[PDB]
Structures are given as C-alpha cells and as structure tokens.
Amino acid sequence: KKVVLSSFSIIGDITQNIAKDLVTVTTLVEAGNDSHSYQVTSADAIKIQNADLILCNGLHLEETFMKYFTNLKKGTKIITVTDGINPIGVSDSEPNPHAWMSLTNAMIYIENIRKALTALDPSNAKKYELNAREYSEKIRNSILPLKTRIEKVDPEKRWFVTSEGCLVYLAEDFGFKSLYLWPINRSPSMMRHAINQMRSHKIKFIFSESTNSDQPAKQVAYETNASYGGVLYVDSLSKPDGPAPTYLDLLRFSLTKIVDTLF
Numbered sequence: 001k002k003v004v005l006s007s008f009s010i011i012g013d014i015t016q017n018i019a020k021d022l023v024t025v026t027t028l029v030e031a032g033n034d035s036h037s038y039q040v041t042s043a044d045a046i047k048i049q050n051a052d053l054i055l056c057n058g059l060h061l062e063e064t065f066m067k068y069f070t071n072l073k074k075g076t077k078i079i080t081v082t083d084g085i086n087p088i089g090v091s092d093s094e095p096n097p098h099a100w101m102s103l104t105n106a107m108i109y110i111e112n113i114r115k116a117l118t119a120l121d122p123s124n125a126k127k128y129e130l131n132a133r134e135y136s137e138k139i140r141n142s143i144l145p146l147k148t149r150i151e152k153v154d155p156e157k158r159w160f161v162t163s164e165g166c167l168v169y170l171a172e173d174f175g176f177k178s179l180y181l182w183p184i185n186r187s188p189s190m191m192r193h194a195i196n197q198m199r200s201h202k203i204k205f206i207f208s209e210s211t212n213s214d215q216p217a218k219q220v221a222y223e224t225n226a227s228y229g230g231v232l233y234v235d236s237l238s239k240p241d242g243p244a245p246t247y248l249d250l251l252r253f254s255l256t257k258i259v260d261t262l263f
C-alpha cells in the first residue's frame with residue numbers, strides 16, 4: 001500500500017477525500033501547529049522516508065523545512081499542489097501562501113492531487129477520478145451558497161479585513177478588497193495603514209485567526225470604531241471536536257462567519 005505524505009493538515013484532508021484509503025495518507029504539520037513555526041522531529045523523518053509521494057503547498061509555505069525533504073526514498077517526488085494558481089505577493093515579492101482560501105482554488109488543489117495520485121497509482125485511476133469529482137461537488141454544494149449570499153454585499157462594504165493576510169486569494173476569487181496587519185504569521189506601519197484604510201472606507205469589522213493573537217485586531221477595532229469580528233479558521237484544521245476538523249468544514253466555517261458579519 002502506497003504512502004502519501006502531505007505537508008500540513010489542509011492538504012492531508014483533501015488527499016484523504018480523493019484517495020479514500022486506496023493509499024495511506026500521512027501529515028507532517030499536524031492540526032494545531034502552523035507551518036510558519038514547525039520543528040521537524042525524528043519521528044517526522046520516518047514519515048518522510050516512508051513517503052512514496054510528498055504533497056506540498058508551495059508558495060513558500062514549507063520554506064523553513066524543505067531541507068528535511070532530502071535523502072528520500074528512490075523515486076519519491078515532491079508535488080506542489082498549487083501548480084496553476086497565479087501567486088499573489090506579500091508586498092514584486094515573496095508569494096502569499098494562503099491559496100486554499102478560495103472556491104476556485106479548492107478545485108485546483110483537488111485536481112493537482114487527483115493527477116499526482118493517479119500517476120503514483122495508475123491502476124486506481126477510475127477511483128481517484130470518481131472520488132475527485134464527488135469531493136469537488138461536495139465542496140461546491142457547501143460553499144457556493146455562501147459565495148452567492150456574499151456577492152449581494154453593497155460594493156463599498158466589499159472588504160475582508162483580518163490580522164494575517166490569510167484571505168487575499170478569497171478576495172481575488174469573490175471580487176473583494178483585502179486589508180490586514182501582516183502578510184504571514186508584524187510591523188507598526190502596516191498597523192497604521194490598516195487603521196487609516198479602515199477609517200477612510202468606514203470598514204465595520206476586523207477578524208483574527210485561530211493560530212494567532214486576537215489583541216492586534218481588537219486594538220485596531222478600537223482605534224477605528226470598528227467591531228472585532230471574532231476568530232476565523234485559515235492556517236490549520238481545528239482539533240476533531242473543534243468547528244473546522246476538515247478542509248470543507250474550515251471553508252464553510254470561515255466563510256459563514258464572514259458572510260454573517262457583512263450582513
């Protein structure tokens with residue numbers, strides 16, 4: 001039985017829905033850790049040796065631990081599952097890694113993982129084909145109604161404001177503008193800028209996220225006369241009893257919370 005190692009929980013969950021136990025799906029940065037601050041362990045090196053295929057986000061998400069993907073099993077490839085996604089920069093600059101926060105991009109992650117699994121395990125092509133389409137429609141069925149309601153927002157309430165720049169791909173996909181305090185899980189000028197921008201556009205809400213502090217968002221809410229919108233799930237699946245234990249649940253939770261704020 002082949003073993004497919006995903007770099008973090010969001011990719012591991014997508015892969016599990018495409019492979020459904022045809023392969024063993026493992027995860028390096030488990031739910032609760034972010035990629036942004038992950039220490040590769042000895043036991044992790046075992047997961048890395050056992051991998052027949054390694055699925056990374058790319059867009060520099062794994063930059064600090066790419067050096068551990070070395071001395072690999074012969075024949076083991078590293079596949080970047082964001083292939084085909086036009087990068088959004090962090091400033092000409094380093095890419096923003098959060099491409100999975102997008103309904104369009106969900107379909108591209110699924111397609112790239114379907115393609116990689118099928119090249120790895122061609123005798124199950126028909127099953128990965130079927131599973132990928134079923135899962136793409138599951139995502140569409142849950143998420144498209146959220147998109148539909150949020151597209152009703154008045155064109156000057158079209159702002160997603162967060163702490164980390166975790167929604168830039170969502171903004172691009174749905175036609176909104178972004179504002180945030182720092183691109184990747186911090187600087188005084190970016191905070192000053194967000195405060196100014198919120199005041200000039202009369203922005204009503206700012207969120208924080210499940211792996212970072214709520215204090216800068218609450219502070220900005222105060223200074224701008226906006227409201228703190230609460231916590232979004234964007235960088236990691238929640239624990240099993242939390243609200244975002246799967247990638248579908250994560251998109252559904254965070255987009256629900258955004259749309260519920262904008263109306």
Ligand SMILES: [Mn+2]
Binds near residue numbers: 184234
């Ligand atoms: Mn992040």
